[model samples]
Target: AKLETVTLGNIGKDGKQTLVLNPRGVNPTNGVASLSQAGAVPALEKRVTVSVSQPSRNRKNYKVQVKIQNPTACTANGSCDPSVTRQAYADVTFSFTQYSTDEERAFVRTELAALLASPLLIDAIDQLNPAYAYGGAKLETVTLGNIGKDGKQTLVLNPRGVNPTNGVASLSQAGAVPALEKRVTVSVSQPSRNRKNYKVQVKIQNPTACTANGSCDPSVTRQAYADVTFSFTQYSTDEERAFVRTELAALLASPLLIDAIDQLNPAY
Candidate 1:
């Protein structure tokens, strides 16, 4: 089919704009004009920065960091409106046994980019939330939708801190779990709408404190696989709880997460 030719007016003031597709390739100067006529603009900025790094673990891991910046305005009609501007960032990492070829690595990245760029992330989360059965709780402003202006949706997929003494945690957006002195948070986020794929992370505070060096001070804490987190949220249906229970149980019990867990906290 033939395409329409839009004028410079439709493009913009300079008519030359750049586009950044998170994780994938970028067309730096021709997309500005394209977005103007398209109604929706670039999900991520063209200047989005990306990088890859190495880790101490022998397991192959790839990391991508995209620099993001967003603006907010004050809506109050009073004199104490101290509006501030700041920059932010979203990062995702890929882990696997090993990359047989450079092409294989690139392929993996491209696949993730597609998921990161998915516009339906927020929708999927919205749908997935109520399924959890959080008695009578309200979603946090952070969890309800995509608050990250850079096209990424950041939400806590799992629980909170674990109790050092009692051993408890929190799973549902509005429920409880283990007792946490430090807190274990699992988060899933995306690249700006410009990118595809998403990032999932499990963060547990350093139970062990070290002097300045990177050695364990023996004083620390941790968690086991999947089956444990679900003991908290009493979803409306036991079936729903049972489903996630098995999945999580299997996941955490798997040698993969188990290996990583033992590696991070030897106490496990």
Candidate 2:
């Protein structure tokens, strides 16, 4: 029998590319002259043949077709094993360089931080690519800096007052007060599980504050307040969902918060 011929097409613009075979080359051959059959000699060779088609003179992009001939087929366990089918894929990357000013950098950083804290801002990320799943908060490592005396120069969290727990509060409640900042280099970890919201609150005590009865200072008393609140929301992922459920269950199982909730709602 004469040697069979195979053809490949669309080699793409040259610079080194890969050509894949359908029913890949390694699959076992069955029926007539299987690779494992005795006295069966198979011939295999690789070659690149260019297309003679010409491109339109005014066209900026050109198409080059490639062909493969007389490809081999394999079979496994009484069935054609196309698992190794040879196929081709291409990845094209285009990049550019641009300059960004300090103001631009700051704005971008601020916006990015806001996106990380709020799931609403990330809706566009998921909409941009329908084929891929997107939208999740990622923890960012940042160096906590001191806010200059000007107050205008400050490293405030994004979407001002929006906390990780999706609550609204000030820096003090967020535990991000400059005095408590202490400059610890630690990684702000993303939620291990998806959550609709997360919040952190800080309580503070102030002396000589107005008394609850509208008195100036009821015999040298103190006032307590929920000083700060931080809130955040993140999209759910499988692993994150599992992690959140486990952690939430653990938190609910705690004797403190559950007992407090029960006490606050006796009817329940």
List lDDT for all candidates, in order.
0.28, 0.25
Best candidate (score: lDDT)? 1
Mind giving the per-residue lDDT tens digits that candidate 1 earns over 1-268?
Answer: 1112212211111224322222333234421111112213433222222223334475244332222222223344665553422212232333322322333233333222232222222222222232112441232322323322232443442334333343222333332322323233334332434443333333322122223454633332221111111111112232322222222322232232222222321111
Off by over 4 Å in 2: 1-210, 213-242, 245-257, 260-268
**Measured by TM-score, how close is model 2 to the native structure?**
0.17
Tens digit of per-residue lDDT, candidate 2, span 167-246: 22222213343333212111122233664343322222211222366554233221211122223344323232222222
What lDDT score is found at residue 169 in candidate 1? 27
Q: Which candidate has the top score in TM-score?
A: 1
